[PDB]
Amino acid sequence: TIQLENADTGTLDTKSVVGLVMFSQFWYWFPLAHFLSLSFTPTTVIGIRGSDQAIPKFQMNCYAKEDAFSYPRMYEEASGKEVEKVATAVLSTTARAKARAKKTKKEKGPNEEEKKKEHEEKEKERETNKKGIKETKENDEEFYKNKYSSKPYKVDNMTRILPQQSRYISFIKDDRFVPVRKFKGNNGVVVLRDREPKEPVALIETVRQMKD
């Protein structure tokens, strides 16, 4: 996400103010386009163990209901010009048939009475006896965001969190990891108090250090 400033003290980010004056002049000189990179800031909640200093895996409680994790898709479809064309073709031929067809219907019926209806004898007493529809029900989510709520869902540690769903975060007190102070109410580096340094903890080892 693009931030105007740090939200931790509400004080100007230096990388952001420069970034934007350079970016915005770009009818003038096109290579000043990569300067926007200094504005983009990563948004994630980062736990730090107190005894080893590394990221543990554990789950924080996040109140109903998700403002992200959609990941919607882009596509192109050009094969639907063929589907459209035959749909209308099959529709049209029936209309034309209207005059021949009346004469057929009278002769057609006795054939069905004798043999079978369509794949079994059963249910030839009406022309159609079975109508309806199996679903009419659909409301998806019960609101786009339900604020502070009593409904929990679980979120992982190092997940894509935006500030709107970041507020709903409450670090659990069953597990070891609870902040030394309190939460700050936003995304960012936050150091957590390790209850057990001697019980097994699942950790995520940073990418650069594995490769080294």
Partner: protein, 289 residues
């Protein structure tokens, strides 16, 4: 490749634009020609300082109508006073056509390019400068071999992407696809802005110059009379016009060709005049005597 490789933004000096215009206008209808003298800085900034005309011909613009003698001699005159630079290109007039090089000029531009590869051709219309807006455009060739090598996007790198066009079909095909256009901007100092801005020595002393009062009486009489007739027109308009659908009503009862707007306009106009006329008389009577 290794440079900006784009056509210069021709910055035409305050002197120069007027001088091409005066020189093109005298010869209308016959085609005019001449040299642009200037200096080349950047890779894409040519400031054209001054101009000189190459004399008339009886077959008008030709490559042939270039004469080395006139060009070089006139050049040695300016040398002695040290106002000479280097030939950055040339101007010529199509007053019978729009902005675009004619079939002859593209071949003249090829010779000129050869000598100096930054050579521009500026086509001046002295006959479409009888407007409030001067019609003037600049072009420079992109070679036939160049189009084959597909080096056309090279010329439009590092620009605002704002180009000029002139009519459609034939004119436009020549413009974009065989030559390249770049906008023209106007360059000036604050010394020259003052020289143009000035006028007479009694233009700054023309509000004491009252008018003859016969003429001011005329102004009084006309405005009052005319407003009686547009007012009459204003009465007819608002007798109806109050059913539904606004445009319809305005088409029906003369609400288009609006008298309401026009009555206000006349009144205001004659109103601002007469405040100053009273002001003028009251100053001159008391001030002088």
């Amino acid at each position: 490749t290794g440079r900006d490789d784009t056509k210069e933004t021709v910055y035409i000096s305050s002197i120069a634009l007027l001088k091409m215009l005066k020189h093109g206008r005298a010869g209308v209808p016959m085609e005019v020609m001449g040299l642009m003298l200037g200096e080349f800085v950047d890779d894409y900034t040519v400031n054209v300082v001054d101009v000189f005309a190459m004399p008339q011909s009886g077959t008008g613009v030709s490559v042939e109508a270039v004469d080395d003698v006139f060009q070089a001699k006139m050049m040695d005159m300016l040398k002695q006073t040290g106002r000479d630079q280097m030939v950055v290109g040339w101007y010529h007039s199509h007053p019978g056509f729009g902005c675009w090089l004619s079939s002859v000029d593209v071949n003249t531009q090829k010779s000129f390019e050869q000598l100096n590869s930054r050579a521009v051709a500026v086509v001046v219309d002295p006959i479409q400068s009888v407007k409030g807006k001067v019609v003037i455009d600049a072009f420079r060739l992109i070679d036939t071999g160049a189009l084959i090598n597909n080096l056309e996007p090279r010329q439009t790198t590092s620009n605002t992407g704002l180009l000029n066009k002139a009519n459609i079909q034939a004119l436009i095909h020549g413009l974009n696809r065989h030559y390249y256009s770049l906008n023209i901007d106007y360059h000036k100092t604050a010394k020259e802005t003052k020289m143009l801005m000035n006028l007479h020595k009694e233009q700054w002393q023309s509000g004491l110059k009252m008018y003859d009062y016969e003429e001011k009486e005329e102004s009084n009489l006309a405005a009052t009379k005319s407003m009686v007739k547009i007012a009459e027109q204003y009465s007819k308009r608002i007798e109806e016009e109050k059913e539904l659908t606004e445009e319809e009503l305005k088409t029906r009862y003369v609400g288009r060709q609006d008298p309401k707007k026009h009555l206000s306009e006349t009144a205001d106009e004659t109103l601002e005049n007469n405040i100053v006329s009273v002001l003028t008389a009251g100053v001159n009577s008391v001030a002088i005597k």
